[PDB]
């Protein structure tokens, strides 16, 4: 009956976090609400780094909201890390949030280099309508 | 048909020296069916199981330099009384180039109607709220 | 009950030393729709996805004449086959500079976070684990806590 959707990161498609899906629609790498109400939107994803590297590096997740109404990209959730032997570091966010008919979300990070799909299926980015 | 479902995400005003102060009138953030934001506290309405969250985004420059200890707590106080529910630790300093830490915490809980729920940090100093999405507390009924 | 859905939260004994060990018989830790601790073990009721989820917290008092390894691990045992899996696993190194007996000792915190989401099959039995309990830190509660929601 509540709409939803839990997309994975491609592993394949190596320095891109490109979403693949498997009742919410993945239109342009973006979800699409199909109708206005509370929603559950969650994700997570893990970088890995092979050592520290002297430029100080900072790695970004955000989920963003692309109002149906006012055409711009909004940030719901958004982390930031520093993680500077090969380091792991996780970055997990999620809310409620009322979300219009059309609405695009993007679950978006800054390096791709520094993804690891090793554990991927464990890279992910999710809606469920309350 | 909406959801008749009690949730709250409330987000920190980025003018609040020394505090974190939970803003619920404010765009994409949101109080409803009955959740209430009283005392920078959320109030349920309702007895059930909860799912509660809270990010904090640290940051500070360059690592200046003892024992900087970043604690994130979500307390809850039941209708007659804190007692901890989730709760993170972390010393962003090793060594003594601005760091970045972030702290999520998240669980699902029994709640009765009437119960307040706090989402504090020991050093609002080294918070951040340059960027929207970077400091929230919600709750989500089941 | 509002929902129908498996959902749990243990939390860690603090008095039980040397070990880690889960408890929902406690103010804020919870078990329902299904879900059961045994054998420090959360059982999954239902086929589904679930979101498992586990916080563990070590602290040392200075770093010594050694090099420390912590680790973390959500491990998965399935009725079918007696198929053991590892689900999520961290470790970590909480020293990488030696404190020399002269210098102070300055007390080290390093928090695990496991999280994911994953088809649980019913019976399956999910096990929260660490190497070392001897690390672990129950200054304040609310630290070390495993879990898990069905979507
Ligand atoms: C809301 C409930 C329960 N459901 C539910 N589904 C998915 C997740 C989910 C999945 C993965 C992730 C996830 C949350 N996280 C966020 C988080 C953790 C703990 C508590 N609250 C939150 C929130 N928001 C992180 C980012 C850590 C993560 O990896 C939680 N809950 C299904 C819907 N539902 C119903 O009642 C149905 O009507």
């Known amino acids: 009956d509540k709409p939803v959707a839990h997309v994975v990161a491609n592993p394949q498609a190596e320095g ?6 498997r009742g919410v629609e993945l239109r342009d790498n973006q979800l699409v609400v199909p109708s206005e109400g509370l929603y559950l939107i ?39 890390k520093s993680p500077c032997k090969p380091w792991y570091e996780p ?25 690891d799909f090793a554990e991927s299926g464990q890279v992910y980015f999710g809606i469920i309508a309350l």
């Open 16 to 21: 891109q976090l490109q979403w693949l899906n």
């Open 42 to 80: 969650y994700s997570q994803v893990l970088f890995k780094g092979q050592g520290c590297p002297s430029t100080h590096v900072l790695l970004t997740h955000t989920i963003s909201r692309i109002a149906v109404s006012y055409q711009t990209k909004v940030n719901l959730l958004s982390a930031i």
């Open 91 to 115: 970055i997990y966010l999620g809310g409620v949030f009322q979300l219009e008919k059309g609405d695009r979300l993007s679950a978006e990070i800054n390096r791709p280099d520094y993804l």
